[PDB]
Amino acid sequence: AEIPKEHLRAQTNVILLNVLKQGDNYVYGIIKQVKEASNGEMELNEATLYTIFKRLEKDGIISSYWGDESQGGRRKYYRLTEIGHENXRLLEESWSRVDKIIENLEANKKS
Amino acid sequence: PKEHLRAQTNVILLNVLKQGDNYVYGIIKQVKEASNGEMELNEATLYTIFKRLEKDGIISSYWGDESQGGRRKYYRLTEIGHENXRLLEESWSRVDKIIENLEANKK
């Protein structure tokens, strides 16, 4: 009927960590880049991001800082911590094993 | 993260039932065999998860043949379940596409 929240949550978390793995980033840019990378199909919800980033920041996975004010407004940047980088590696390793397990489930059914 | 563990377990379980109807120990056995012994799912945990999935219409259950003595509860992926699996594939495929384009556009 619908995508379970645990998958939605995991998908958004995977997207965000890949974005911040590429570089420090801010909410407007993250939303725009993901929108562009999804050919318009994924417009992340701004309130949700502010929500996730405060959690991720309390768990030490990201840190934040203000950009320069030369142009009037300032961006709030987010940075992947060394903890966050280890977390990205753990996700990559574990999903990779899960994909192989599923591949092996099909192969073992061929029997 | 728990949501990833949770999602990972969920997709494994749905894939097992996509391969065929199965019972809790048979699923555990198959996952252990498919992971070279590395993933040994907890029998009480699955039992819990399957009761949730069943109340939510994603799987249904029925009793197996008792010719070898005891009673085994089998589970089947419902039509809702097959559609949920199709939605997971679609949405994760988009995530994979997004990530590939994020690197490609960076260059």
PDB file of all heavy atoms in Angstrom, chain A residues 82-111:
ATOM      1  N   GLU A  82      33.940  12.960  11.465  1.00  0.00           N
ATOM      2  CA  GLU A  82      34.662  11.698  11.305  1.00  0.00           C
ATOM      3  C   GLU A  82      33.793  10.536  11.767  1.00  0.00           C
ATOM      4  O   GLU A  82      33.836   9.443  11.194  1.00  0.00           O
ATOM      5  CB  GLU A  82      36.004  11.749  12.048  1.00  0.00           C
ATOM      6  CG  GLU A  82      37.206  12.049  11.128  1.00  0.00           C
ATOM      7  CD  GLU A  82      38.554  12.092  11.855  1.00  0.00           C
ATOM      8  OE1 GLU A  82      38.651  11.574  12.984  1.00  0.00           O
ATOM      9  OE2 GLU A  82      39.521  12.650  11.288  1.00  0.00           O
ATOM     10  N   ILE A  83      32.992  10.762  12.811  1.00  0.00           N
ATOM     11  CA  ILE A  83      31.951   9.807  13.197  1.00  0.00           C
ATOM     12  C   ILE A  83      30.976   9.568  12.044  1.00  0.00           C
ATOM     13  O   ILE A  83      30.666   8.421  11.695  1.00  0.00           O
ATOM     14  CB  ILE A  83      31.208  10.351  14.435  1.00  0.00           C
ATOM     15  CG1 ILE A  83      32.068  10.242  15.690  1.00  0.00           C
ATOM     16  CG2 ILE A  83      29.872   9.686  14.582  1.00  0.00           C
ATOM     17  CD1 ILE A  83      31.605  11.176  16.815  1.00  0.00           C
ATOM     18  N   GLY A  84      30.470  10.650  11.445  1.00  0.00           N
ATOM     19  CA  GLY A  84      29.569  10.518  10.313  1.00  0.00           C
ATOM     20  C   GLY A  84      30.201   9.767   9.158  1.00  0.00           C
ATOM     21  O   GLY A  84      29.534   9.025   8.449  1.00  0.00           O
ATOM     22  N   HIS A  85      31.496   9.969   8.942  1.00  0.00           N
ATOM     23  CA  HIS A  85      32.164   9.251   7.873  1.00  0.00           C
ATOM     24  C   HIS A  85      32.239   7.763   8.185  1.00  0.00           C
ATOM     25  O   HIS A  85      32.081   6.927   7.296  1.00  0.00           O
ATOM     26  CB  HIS A  85      33.566   9.823   7.650  1.00  0.00           C
ATOM     27  CG  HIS A  85      33.593  10.992   6.722  1.00  0.00           C
ATOM     28  ND1 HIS A  85      33.661  12.300   7.159  1.00  0.00           N
ATOM     29  CD2 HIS A  85      33.552  11.044   5.370  1.00  0.00           C
ATOM     30  CE1 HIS A  85      33.649  13.108   6.111  1.00  0.00           C
ATOM     31  NE2 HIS A  85      33.606  12.366   5.015  1.00  0.00           N
ATOM     32  N   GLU A  86      32.458   7.423   9.450  1.00  0.00           N
ATOM     33  CA  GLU A  86      32.504   6.011   9.823  1.00  0.00           C
ATOM     34  C   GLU A  86      31.116   5.404   9.712  1.00  0.00           C
ATOM     35  O   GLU A  86      30.956   4.262   9.272  1.00  0.00           O
ATOM     36  CB  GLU A  86      33.078   5.853  11.224  1.00  0.00           C
ATOM     37  CG  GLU A  86      33.312   4.393  11.624  1.00  0.00           C
ATOM     38  CD  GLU A  86      34.138   3.628  10.599  1.00  0.00           C
ATOM     39  OE1 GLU A  86      35.015   4.244   9.960  1.00  0.00           O
ATOM     40  OE2 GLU A  86      33.911   2.413  10.426  1.00  0.00           O
ATOM     41  N   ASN A  87      30.102   6.172  10.064  1.00  0.00           N
ATOM     42  CA  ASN A  87      28.725   5.797   9.859  1.00  0.00           C
ATOM     43  C   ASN A  87      28.326   5.538   8.391  1.00  0.00           C
ATOM     44  O   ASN A  87      27.590   4.598   8.118  1.00  0.00           O
ATOM     45  CB  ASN A  87      27.887   6.913  10.439  1.00  0.00           C
ATOM     46  CG  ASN A  87      26.534   6.504  10.732  1.00  0.00           C
ATOM     47  OD1 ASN A  87      26.231   6.101  11.850  1.00  0.00           O
ATOM     48  ND2 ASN A  87      25.676   6.600   9.746  1.00  0.00           N
ATOM     49  N   UNK A  88      28.835   6.339   7.461  1.00  0.00           N
ATOM     50  CA  UNK A  88      28.573   6.183   6.031  1.00  0.00           C
ATOM     51  C   UNK A  88      29.237   4.834   5.653  1.00  0.00           C
ATOM     52  O   UNK A  88      28.633   4.145   4.846  1.00  0.00           O
ATOM     53  CB  UNK A  88      29.113   7.209   5.033  1.00  0.00           C
ATOM     54  N   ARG A  89      30.443   4.536   6.180  1.00  0.00           N
ATOM     55  CA  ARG A  89      31.158   3.347   5.743  1.00  0.00           C
ATOM     56  C   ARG A  89      30.399   2.135   6.229  1.00  0.00           C
ATOM     57  O   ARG A  89      30.260   1.179   5.502  1.00  0.00           O
ATOM     58  CB  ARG A  89      32.611   3.336   6.234  1.00  0.00           C
ATOM     59  CG  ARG A  89      33.569   4.228   5.367  1.00  0.00           C
ATOM     60  CD  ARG A  89      35.062   4.024   5.715  1.00  0.00           C
ATOM     61  NE  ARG A  89      35.408   4.577   7.022  1.00  0.00           N
ATOM     62  CZ  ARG A  89      35.846   5.814   7.233  1.00  0.00           C
ATOM     63  NH1 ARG A  89      36.043   6.662   6.237  1.00  0.00           N
ATOM     64  NH2 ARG A  89      36.057   6.220   8.479  1.00  0.00           N
ATOM     65  N   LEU A  90      29.884   2.219   7.456  1.00  0.00           N
ATOM     66  CA  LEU A  90      29.095   1.125   8.014  1.00  0.00           C
ATOM     67  C   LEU A  90      27.806   0.892   7.242  1.00  0.00           C
ATOM     68  O   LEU A  90      27.404  -0.265   7.031  1.00  0.00           O
ATOM     69  CB  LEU A  90      28.791   1.440   9.464  1.00  0.00           C
ATOM     70  CG  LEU A  90      29.907   1.139  10.453  1.00  0.00           C
ATOM     71  CD1 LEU A  90      29.360   1.450  11.817  1.00  0.00           C
ATOM     72  CD2 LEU A  90      30.315  -0.328  10.347  1.00  0.00           C
ATOM     73  N   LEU A  91      27.134   1.961   6.804  1.00  0.00           N
ATOM     74  CA  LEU A  91      25.944   1.775   5.986  1.00  0.00           C
ATOM     75  C   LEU A  91      26.260   1.107   4.668  1.00  0.00           C
ATOM     76  O   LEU A  91      25.480   0.273   4.194  1.00  0.00           O
ATOM     77  CB  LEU A  91      25.245   3.088   5.689  1.00  0.00           C
ATOM     78  CG  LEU A  91      24.416   3.662   6.819  1.00  0.00           C
ATOM     79  CD1 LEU A  91      23.808   4.996   6.374  1.00  0.00           C
ATOM     80  CD2 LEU A  91      23.311   2.653   7.149  1.00  0.00           C
ATOM     81  N   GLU A  92      27.323   1.578   3.996  1.00  0.00           N
ATOM     82  CA  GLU A  92      27.740   1.017   2.713  1.00  0.00           C
ATOM     83  C   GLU A  92      28.079  -0.445   2.853  1.00  0.00           C
ATOM     84  O   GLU A  92      27.732  -1.262   1.991  1.00  0.00           O
ATOM     85  CB  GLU A  92      28.956   1.780   2.146  1.00  0.00           C
ATOM     86  CG  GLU A  92      29.386   1.377   0.712  1.00  0.00           C
ATOM     87  CD  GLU A  92      30.207   0.080   0.603  1.00  0.00           C
ATOM     88  OE1 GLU A  92      30.847  -0.335   1.590  1.00  0.00           O
ATOM     89  OE2 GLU A  92      30.225  -0.524  -0.494  1.00  0.00           O
ATOM     90  N   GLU A  93      28.795  -0.792   3.901  1.00  0.00           N
ATOM     91  CA  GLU A  93      29.190  -2.182   4.045  1.00  0.00           C
ATOM     92  C   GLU A  93      27.950  -3.037   4.306  1.00  0.00           C
ATOM     93  O   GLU A  93      27.778  -4.102   3.694  1.00  0.00           O
ATOM     94  CB  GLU A  93      30.237  -2.287   5.148  1.00  0.00           C
ATOM     95  CG  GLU A  93      30.839  -3.665   5.323  1.00  0.00           C
ATOM     96  CD  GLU A  93      31.766  -3.733   6.518  1.00  0.00           C
ATOM     97  OE1 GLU A  93      32.063  -2.663   7.102  1.00  0.00           O
ATOM     98  OE2 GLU A  93      32.211  -4.847   6.866  1.00  0.00           O
ATOM     99  N   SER A  94      27.049  -2.559   5.168  1.00  0.00           N
ATOM    100  CA  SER A  94      25.935  -3.404   5.567  1.00  0.00           C
ATOM    101  C   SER A  94      24.914  -3.541   4.453  1.00  0.00           C
ATOM    102  O   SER A  94      24.405  -4.636   4.224  1.00  0.00           O
ATOM    103  CB  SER A  94      25.263  -2.887   6.855  1.00  0.00           C
ATOM    104  OG  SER A  94      24.785  -1.583   6.733  1.00  0.00           O
ATOM    105  N   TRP A  95      24.629  -2.467   3.710  1.00  0.00           N
ATOM    106  CA  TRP A  95      23.711  -2.627   2.580  1.00  0.00           C
ATOM    107  C   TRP A  95      24.334  -3.479   1.493  1.00  0.00           C
ATOM    108  O   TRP A  95      23.620  -4.195   0.783  1.00  0.00           O
ATOM    109  CB  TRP A  95      23.266  -1.270   2.009  1.00  0.00           C
ATOM    110  CG  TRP A  95      22.074  -0.697   2.732  1.00  0.00           C
ATOM    111  CD1 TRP A  95      22.091   0.368   3.556  1.00  0.00           C
ATOM    112  CD2 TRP A  95      20.709  -1.129   2.671  1.00  0.00           C
ATOM    113  NE1 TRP A  95      20.853   0.629   4.051  1.00  0.00           N
ATOM    114  CE2 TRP A  95      19.971  -0.288   3.527  1.00  0.00           C
ATOM    115  CE3 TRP A  95      20.043  -2.142   1.985  1.00  0.00           C
ATOM    116  CZ2 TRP A  95      18.621  -0.422   3.723  1.00  0.00           C
ATOM    117  CZ3 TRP A  95      18.686  -2.270   2.178  1.00  0.00           C
ATOM    118  CH2 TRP A  95      17.991  -1.416   3.026  1.00  0.00           C
ATOM    119  N   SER A  96      25.643  -3.380   1.308  1.00  0.00           N
ATOM    120  CA  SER A  96      26.285  -4.243   0.330  1.00  0.00           C
ATOM    121  C   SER A  96      26.124  -5.706   0.702  1.00  0.00           C
ATOM    122  O   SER A  96      25.820  -6.537  -0.151  1.00  0.00           O
ATOM    123  CB  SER A  96      27.772  -3.857   0.212  1.00  0.00           C
ATOM    124  OG  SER A  96      28.476  -4.744  -0.604  1.00  0.00           O
ATOM    125  N   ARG A  97      26.313  -6.054   1.967  1.00  0.00           N
ATOM    126  CA  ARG A  97      26.108  -7.439   2.368  1.00  0.00           C
ATOM    127  C   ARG A  97      24.649  -7.841   2.192  1.00  0.00           C
ATOM    128  O   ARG A  97      24.359  -8.979   1.835  1.00  0.00           O
ATOM    129  CB  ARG A  97      26.575  -7.643   3.802  1.00  0.00           C
ATOM    130  CG  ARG A  97      26.546  -9.060   4.294  1.00  0.00           C
ATOM    131  CD  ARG A  97      27.047 -10.090   3.234  1.00  0.00           C
ATOM    132  NE  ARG A  97      27.460 -11.344   3.820  1.00  0.00           N
ATOM    133  CZ  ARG A  97      27.677 -12.437   3.111  1.00  0.00           C
ATOM    134  NH1 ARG A  97      27.402 -12.474   1.817  1.00  0.00           N
ATOM    135  NH2 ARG A  97      28.177 -13.515   3.709  1.00  0.00           N
ATOM    136  N   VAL A  98      23.720  -6.935   2.470  1.00  0.00           N
ATOM    137  CA  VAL A  98      22.300  -7.251   2.319  1.00  0.00           C
ATOM    138  C   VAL A  98      21.991  -7.506   0.868  1.00  0.00           C
ATOM    139  O   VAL A  98      21.295  -8.450   0.517  1.00  0.00           O
ATOM    140  CB  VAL A  98      21.426  -6.118   2.895  1.00  0.00           C
ATOM    141  CG1 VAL A  98      20.005  -6.258   2.406  1.00  0.00           C
ATOM    142  CG2 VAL A  98      21.553  -6.043   4.434  1.00  0.00           C
ATOM    143  N   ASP A  99      22.539  -6.696  -0.025  1.00  0.00           N
ATOM    144  CA  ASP A  99      22.288  -6.973  -1.442  1.00  0.00           C
ATOM    145  C   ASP A  99      22.814  -8.326  -1.857  1.00  0.00           C
ATOM    146  O   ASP A  99      22.168  -9.038  -2.619  1.00  0.00           O
ATOM    147  CB  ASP A  99      22.923  -5.872  -2.318  1.00  0.00           C
ATOM    148  CG  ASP A  99      22.292  -4.514  -2.105  1.00  0.00           C
ATOM    149  OD1 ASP A  99      21.154  -4.436  -1.589  1.00  0.00           O
ATOM    150  OD2 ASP A  99      22.926  -3.517  -2.492  1.00  0.00           O
ATOM    151  N   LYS A 100      23.997  -8.707  -1.386  1.00  0.00           N
ATOM    152  CA  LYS A 100      24.537 -10.009  -1.760  1.00  0.00           C
ATOM    153  C   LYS A 100      23.722 -11.150  -1.166  1.00  0.00           C
ATOM    154  O   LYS A 100      23.517 -12.179  -1.800  1.00  0.00           O
ATOM    155  CB  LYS A 100      26.027 -10.077  -1.353  1.00  0.00           C
ATOM    156  CG  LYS A 100      26.643 -11.442  -1.642  1.00  0.00           C
ATOM    157  CD  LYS A 100      26.898 -11.594  -3.182  1.00  0.00           C
ATOM    158  CE  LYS A 100      27.815 -12.739  -3.541  1.00  0.00           C
ATOM    159  NZ  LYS A 100      28.397 -12.628  -4.923  1.00  0.00           N
ATOM    160  N   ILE A 101      23.238 -10.975   0.069  1.00  0.00           N
ATOM    161  CA  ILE A 101      22.387 -11.978   0.667  1.00  0.00           C
ATOM    162  C   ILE A 101      21.166 -12.200  -0.199  1.00  0.00           C
ATOM    163  O   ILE A 101      20.759 -13.336  -0.448  1.00  0.00           O
ATOM    164  CB  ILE A 101      21.981 -11.550   2.092  1.00  0.00           C
ATOM    165  CG1 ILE A 101      23.207 -11.706   2.978  1.00  0.00           C
ATOM    166  CG2 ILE A 101      20.829 -12.402   2.588  1.00  0.00           C
ATOM    167  CD1 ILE A 101      23.014 -11.054   4.292  1.00  0.00           C
ATOM    168  N   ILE A 102      20.536 -11.116  -0.634  1.00  0.00           N
ATOM    169  CA  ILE A 102      19.346 -11.270  -1.480  1.00  0.00           C
ATOM    170  C   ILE A 102      19.695 -11.973  -2.786  1.00  0.00           C
ATOM    171  O   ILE A 102      18.969 -12.886  -3.220  1.00  0.00           O
ATOM    172  CB  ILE A 102      18.681  -9.897  -1.695  1.00  0.00           C
ATOM    173  CG1 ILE A 102      18.064  -9.441  -0.375  1.00  0.00           C
ATOM    174  CG2 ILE A 102      17.673 -10.015  -2.774  1.00  0.00           C
ATOM    175  CD1 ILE A 102      17.793  -7.996  -0.372  1.00  0.00           C
ATOM    176  N   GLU A 103      20.835 -11.600  -3.387  1.00  0.00           N
ATOM    177  CA  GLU A 103      21.321 -12.297  -4.579  1.00  0.00           C
ATOM    178  C   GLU A 103      21.501 -13.769  -4.287  1.00  0.00           C
ATOM    179  O   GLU A 103      21.068 -14.616  -5.071  1.00  0.00           O
ATOM    180  CB  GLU A 103      22.644 -11.670  -5.064  1.00  0.00           C
ATOM    181  CG  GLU A 103      22.506 -10.246  -5.616  1.00  0.00           C
ATOM    182  CD  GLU A 103      23.859  -9.526  -5.923  1.00  0.00           C
ATOM    183  OE1 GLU A 103      24.934 -10.152  -5.875  1.00  0.00           O
ATOM    184  OE2 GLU A 103      23.833  -8.314  -6.199  1.00  0.00           O
ATOM    185  N   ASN A 104      22.055 -14.105  -3.115  1.00  0.00           N
ATOM    186  CA  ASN A 104      22.279 -15.500  -2.776  1.00  0.00           C
ATOM    187  C   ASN A 104      20.949 -16.224  -2.501  1.00  0.00           C
ATOM    188  O   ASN A 104      20.831 -17.429  -2.777  1.00  0.00           O
ATOM    189  CB  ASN A 104      23.228 -15.613  -1.570  1.00  0.00           C
ATOM    190  CG  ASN A 104      24.706 -15.204  -1.872  1.00  0.00           C
ATOM    191  OD1 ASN A 104      25.146 -15.104  -3.036  1.00  0.00           O
ATOM    192  ND2 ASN A 104      25.477 -14.980  -0.805  1.00  0.00           N
ATOM    193  N   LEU A 105      19.944 -15.529  -1.928  1.00  0.00           N
ATOM    194  CA  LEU A 105      18.621 -16.150  -1.754  1.00  0.00           C
ATOM    195  C   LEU A 105      18.028 -16.598  -3.086  1.00  0.00           C
ATOM    196  O   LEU A 105      17.510 -17.708  -3.193  1.00  0.00           O
ATOM    197  CB  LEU A 105      17.642 -15.184  -1.062  1.00  0.00           C
ATOM    198  CG  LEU A 105      17.938 -15.017   0.417  1.00  0.00           C
ATOM    199  CD1 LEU A 105      17.206 -13.771   1.072  1.00  0.00           C
ATOM    200  CD2 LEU A 105      17.612 -16.330   1.185  1.00  0.00           C
ATOM    201  N   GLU A 106      18.132 -15.761  -4.114  1.00  0.00           N
ATOM    202  CA  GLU A 106      17.647 -16.161  -5.433  1.00  0.00           C
ATOM    203  C   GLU A 106      18.488 -17.303  -5.993  1.00  0.00           C
ATOM    204  O   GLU A 106      17.950 -18.330  -6.408  1.00  0.00           O
ATOM    205  CB  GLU A 106      17.670 -14.958  -6.370  1.00  0.00           C
ATOM    206  CG  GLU A 106      16.963 -13.736  -5.794  1.00  0.00           C
ATOM    207  CD  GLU A 106      16.841 -12.556  -6.779  1.00  0.00           C
ATOM    208  OE1 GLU A 106      17.239 -12.688  -7.954  1.00  0.00           O
ATOM    209  OE2 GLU A 106      16.304 -11.503  -6.382  1.00  0.00           O
ATOM    210  N   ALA A 107      19.816 -17.189  -5.927  1.00  0.00           N
ATOM    211  CA  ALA A 107      20.651 -18.263  -6.461  1.00  0.00           C
ATOM    212  C   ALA A 107      20.398 -19.583  -5.757  1.00  0.00           C
ATOM    213  O   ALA A 107      20.388 -20.637  -6.403  1.00  0.00           O
ATOM    214  CB  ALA A 107      22.137 -17.912  -6.369  1.00  0.00           C
ATOM    215  N   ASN A 108      20.260 -19.563  -4.426  1.00  0.00           N
ATOM    216  CA  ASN A 108      20.050 -20.817  -3.711  1.00  0.00           C
ATOM    217  C   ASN A 108      18.680 -21.407  -4.030  1.00  0.00           C
ATOM    218  O   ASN A 108      18.512 -22.631  -3.977  1.00  0.00           O
ATOM    219  CB  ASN A 108      20.252 -20.608  -2.208  1.00  0.00           C
ATOM    220  CG  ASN A 108      21.680 -20.248  -1.870  1.00  0.00           C
ATOM    221  OD1 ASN A 108      22.580 -20.497  -2.676  1.00  0.00           O
ATOM    222  ND2 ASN A 108      21.907 -19.639  -0.684  1.00  0.00           N
ATOM    223  N   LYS A 109      17.696 -20.566  -4.366  1.00  0.00           N
ATOM    224  CA  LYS A 109      16.418 -21.073  -4.852  1.00  0.00           C
ATOM    225  C   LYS A 109      16.564 -21.750  -6.220  1.00  0.00           C
ATOM    226  O   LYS A 109      15.866 -22.737  -6.476  1.00  0.00           O
ATOM    227  CB  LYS A 109      15.359 -19.962  -4.875  1.00  0.00           C
ATOM    228  CG  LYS A 109      13.952 -20.488  -5.200  1.00  0.00           C
ATOM    229  CD  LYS A 109      13.045 -19.412  -5.800  1.00  0.00           C
ATOM    230  CE  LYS A 109      11.598 -19.924  -5.975  1.00  0.00           C
ATOM    231  NZ  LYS A 109      10.626 -18.851  -6.338  1.00  0.00           N
ATOM    232  N   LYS A 110      17.471 -21.273  -7.095  1.00  0.00           N
ATOM    233  CA  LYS A 110      17.701 -21.992  -8.352  1.00  0.00           C
ATOM    234  C   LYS A 110      18.145 -23.419  -8.064  1.00  0.00           C
ATOM    235  O   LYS A 110      17.749 -24.356  -8.767  1.00  0.00           O
ATOM    236  CB  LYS A 110      18.757 -21.321  -9.235  1.00  0.00           C
ATOM    237  CG  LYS A 110      18.542 -19.864  -9.636  1.00  0.00           C
ATOM    238  CD  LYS A 110      17.327 -19.646 -10.546  1.00  0.00           C
ATOM    239  CE  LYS A 110      17.352 -18.255 -11.219  1.00  0.00           C
ATOM    240  NZ  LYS A 110      17.253 -17.119 -10.244  1.00  0.00           N
ATOM    241  N   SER A 111      18.958 -23.606  -7.026  1.00  0.00           N
ATOM    242  CA  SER A 111      19.210 -24.948  -6.510  1.00  0.00           C
ATOM    243  C   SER A 111      19.902 -25.776  -7.584  1.00  0.00           C
ATOM    244  O   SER A 111      20.860 -25.307  -8.194  1.00  0.00           O
ATOM    245  CB  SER A 111      17.891 -25.603  -6.060  1.00  0.00           C
ATOM    246  OG  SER A 111      18.043 -26.987  -5.802  1.00  0.00           O
TER     247      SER A 111
END
